[PDB]
Amino acid sequence: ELPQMVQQLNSPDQQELQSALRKLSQIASGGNEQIQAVIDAGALPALVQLLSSPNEQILQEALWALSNIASGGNEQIQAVIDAGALPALVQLLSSPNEQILQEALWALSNIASGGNEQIQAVIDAGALPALVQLLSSPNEQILQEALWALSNIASGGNEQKQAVKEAGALEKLEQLQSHENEKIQKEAQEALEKLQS
DSSP states (O other): OHHHHHHHTTOSOHHHHHHHHHHHHHHHTSOHHHHHHHHHTTHHHHHHHHTTOSOHHHHHHHHHHHHHHHTSOHHHHHHHHHTTOHHHHHHHTTOSOHHHHHHHHHHHHHHTTSOHHHHHHHHHTTHHHHHHHHTTOSOHHHHHHHHHHHHHHHTSOHHHHHHHHHTTHHHHHHHGGGOSOHHHHHHHHHHHHHHOO
């Protein structure tokens, strides 16, 4: 019934659209075969379009589905990138809605867990200045997520590491070694270790 669910993401009926979205999200949270089923059904272009929704509930569920898909294999990560999700995802890092922000962060972190070229796609989409700004968040959950995302990027190749340094991450990471939260100090230190020569 996947193609019918995907067709419903066009429903003039917001209730029908949201129902279908919730179910696709559920399926995408399964294993890699489940994710591939959702991708094969053509869900990705629809999900990416829904990132433009002014309805924040629809937005949140679309992000949940995309983050799930991005948690699959490198080919499934590649499908999300090829569908053009990245610019909208990076834009959402500046949402005043912190729940939407966190979900976009999850998706980007999952993408940045892929190959060096997938990491480079995240950087090319403008993620670094947005992520570095998030290191200033007073919300420790957001801070930790941004730290994890930057750490994933910093786990890439030399070209990726160099981009992180050029975005000014080194200063803030060193400052965070004095953060009141010991877990944050630790995660910042490890990111610095990855960037070190």
